[PDB]
Write a protein that binds this ligand. Structure first.
Ligand code: 9M0
Ligand code: MG
Length: 299
């Protein structure tokens, strides 16, 4: 039963962030059970002071994490719980190892972590896009997020005041909507020009919101930064979703270089200017570009 999964999770000991390796940008989840990802997720909340500062009951958080996990589709090859889990893991690593934690409020951190885990809820697959611009899919991901956040027993934000709740919901909404790459493509120019001119200032509310959005995209796409054998396997999953609805290997390397140049490099370059300790994401992205390019030239 589902409630048997909850007992095991609620009862278990949550090992530290160091043991779980969740502070490392190089993190991988291929060796982890579903239960183990749920533990790493508890430790993320815990070591960001979110359980303390917003008074989350253990039983509620556990049930919430499991509800979230249930609302991804495992038959979808890439856009599933593991991608969401990894996205949140990258957010955690960017906050701790990347030293972004200090540049944000606790409400912003809570919203990003929840948004990261929720940002692709009930995704059907890039191909399976039959419904019934304005970023329609991300609106549905947020609706799912909200539906779970309001479910009996899953209300991890009950400890917030009414004002804190509405702010956090606003930030969560913005953050999930930022994972539409069309919005990323539309807003990134400003971010890059504000970093190029040395005019970047997080005290400005508009520039904070813009940064929260760019951070979300950095985490969402961070599989492109992983060590080569991890990257290859995650590329393989993406390909299974893009093709097989669940000669081929000729074109893949060139596309990966195309995607890195078009979307990824500038973002990770920009993020590194904001905080130098996020360099490993840029570095890992460059190393993967080198490797795909070598394959693209017929190695
Ligand atoms: O995460 C993405 C990705 C995305 F998020 C949103 C939109 C497009 C994307 O394309 C991606 C490629 C390029 C690509 C495009 C089409 C393909 C393909 C590879 O293989 C088969 O068909 N690589 C990755 C990753 N690779 C590693 C981690 S993320 C992709
Ligand atoms: Mg998405």
């Amino acid at each position: 039963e589902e409630t048997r999964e909850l007992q095991s999770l609620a009862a278990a000991v949550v090992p530290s962030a160091q043991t779980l390796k969740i502070t490392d940008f190089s993190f991988s989840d291929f060796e982890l059970s579903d239960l183990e990802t749920a533990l790493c997720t508890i430790r993320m909340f815990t070591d960001l002071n979110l359980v303390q500062n917003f008074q989350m009951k253990h039983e509620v958080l556990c049930r919430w994490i499991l509800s979230v996990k249930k609302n991804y589709r495992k038959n979808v090859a890439y856009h599933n719980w593991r991608h969401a889990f990894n996205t949140a893991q990258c957010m955690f690593a960017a906050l701790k190892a990347g030293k972004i934690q200090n540049k944000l409020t606790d409400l912003e951190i809570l919203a990003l972590l929840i948004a990261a885990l929720s940002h692709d809820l009930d995704h059907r697959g890039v191909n399976n896009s039959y419904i019934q611009c304005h970023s329609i899919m991300e609106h549905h991901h947020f609706d799912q997020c909200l539906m779970i956040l309001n479910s009996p027993g899953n209300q991890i934000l009950s400890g917030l005041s009414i004002e804190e709740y509405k702010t956090t919901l606003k930030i969560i909404k913005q953050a999930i909507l930022a994972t539409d790459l069309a919005l990323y493509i539309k807003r990134r120019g400003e971010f890059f020009e504000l970093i190029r001119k040395n005019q970047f200032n997080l005290e400005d509310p508009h520039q904070k919101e813009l940064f929260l959005a760019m951070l979300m995209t950095a985490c969402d796409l961070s599989a492109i930064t992983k060590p080569w054998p991890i990257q290859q396997r995650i590329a393989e999953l993406v390909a299974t979703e893009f093709f097989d609805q669940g000669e081929k290997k000729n074109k893949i390397p060139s596309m990966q270089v195309g995607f890195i140049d078009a979307i990824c490099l500038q973002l990770y370059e920009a993020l590194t200017h904001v905080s130098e300790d996020c360099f490993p994401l840029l570095d890992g992205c460059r190393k993967n570009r080198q490797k795909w390019q070598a394959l693209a030239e017929q190695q």
